[PDB]
Symmetry: C3
């Protein structure tokens, strides 16, 4: 069990790690639209989702894994209306065999953001 | 890694797999009230939860696993008033040792459905 | 695959187990502010979050692990405003390397509660 640390994604300031390596898997914390320097990337679903995706990418690689190794993702949206644009961008970063997915619209997300994505992947 | 593909459950049309086998586990995508052909199955929770259950059964089986091997489920409902009905049907398909569970009411689910359930089971 | 059972945490009355030991991990059910006897602990986030933590703790120990072995947690809040209080009490129980975390605000939780935390830990 070892924490994943990288300045390529938003720093984990608080009681959590960007990701954890354990038992053969990598557990990545929910990711939101924040550039590495903490700033809040704003825009429609497409813009925010892209930032979310890059963070995942950064966290996974830093852990010696990657997007192609993600087996499960949990996607929370602020509004189901935003699904299409979210899916279109989501489609860009994942590859066959795609990960198992669960998507739901929640009441609200950290910092009024529109999308948060957490996932689990295989390590190496 | 291996994507699970069965026609006895809604086909995964998009950037995801009905489920993926990896690290000794099976990660099943959130299942909703849809018959294998893709059609919406309407009705109260019981009718919908039964469809979701059948879908899980089909996917898990195709992965060379099953309902008795499920260790965790993430249950999302569109309204907590529906828990009683949901739980009733749910108890039919699971067996001791029962899966660990987390249940919540969310703002909205895919295609206006009222129940979505994702799970993790042991591969055989 | 083995279910975890303990009196130091709300008994699992239903189709689920407080936790399941499988494939090297411990899958813990979503815990809410219920004292072991089944009564509801009421108050602000701090008071309820604390019961939840104590619950998680009792279950993980009964499983053969602990709060220090937790790699992932899914935290559901009823109101996002409650986050700070929840985070302040969350930080008391977890230790570096902290778990991967995903936090979101949902429409409602079991029994009108304001916090539900589920997690996955390494078995010892």
């Amino acid at each position: 069990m070892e924490a994943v640390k990288t300045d390529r994604a938003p720093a984990a300031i608080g009681p959590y790690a960007q990701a954890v390596k354990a038992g053969g898997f990598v557990f990545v914390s929910g990711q939101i639209p924040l550039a590495p320097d903490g700033s809040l990337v704003e825009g429609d679903i497409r813009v925010q989702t892209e930032r979310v995706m890059e963070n995942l990418k950064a966290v996974l690689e830093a852990a010696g894994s990657g997007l192609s190794r993600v087996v499960q993702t949990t996607c929370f949206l602020a509004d189901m209306e935003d699904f299409p644009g979210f899916n279109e961008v989501y489609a860009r970063y994942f590859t066959p065999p795609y990960p198992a997915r669960a998507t739901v619209a929640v009441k609200a997300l950290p910092r009024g953001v529109r999308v948060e994505v957490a996932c689990v992947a295989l390590a190496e």
